[PDB]
Design a binder for this molecule. Sequence first.
Ligand SMILES: *[C@@H](O)[C@@H]1CCC(=O)NCCn2cc(nn2)C[C@H](NC(=O)OCc2ccccc2)C(=O)N[C@@H](CC2CCCCC2)C(=O)N1
Length: 173
Amino acid sequence: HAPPTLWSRVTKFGSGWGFWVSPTVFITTTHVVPTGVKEFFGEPLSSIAIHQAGEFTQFRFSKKMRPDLTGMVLEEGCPEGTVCSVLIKRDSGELLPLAVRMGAIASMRIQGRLVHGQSGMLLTGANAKGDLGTIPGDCGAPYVHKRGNDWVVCGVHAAATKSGNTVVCAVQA
Ligand SMILES: *[C@@H](O)[C@@H]1CCC(=O)NCCn2cc(nn2)C[C@H](NC(=O)OCc2ccccc2)C(=O)N[C@@H](CC2CCCCC2)C(=O)N1
């Protein structure tokens, strides 16, 4: 199970969520980012290094924003067949992890936008029956997996079919 400190990195952002990889690095899905703003988390644009492509957005803040956190490994997707957890939070603070089996990393077009991403299949047998990943507010949620005693983040939720049975996370190139 993703531990409490890992969930504490999942942060409401724009029209979805993002995730603190370290005290200075925040990741999210590009389409959830607010536009026309002068700051993120109170920090001026001039103090943030932005790197975004293919629906993956990274912010690197000049100041330590979340010094409570260790830096963890961010990878460009994961090996095919990895089971990830998508760390979906809801507005109440309820935690709703979504288990997904990952498939190929590829560049694909979704609603006319380039997504550099990794597809995956919802695991019906590892999830409670109910709309995880299939509402706009769930985009940006991180895809994580445990490697040894360490958690790795490898993408951010970007897309899913109507049913939610097939998902895509954006990945950092
Ligand atoms: C977070 O903003 C959204 C999470 C997905 C979601 O809520 N899905 C349920 C509703 N829905 C959306 C779509 N269809 N149903 C459109 C699109 N999904 C899609 O194209 O699936 C087919 C598919 C094709 C190839 C590979 C995998 C699946 C989708 O999810 N769109 C996405 C917004 C776009 C915005 C512009 C950049 C890329 C994502 C979305 O609704 N995400």
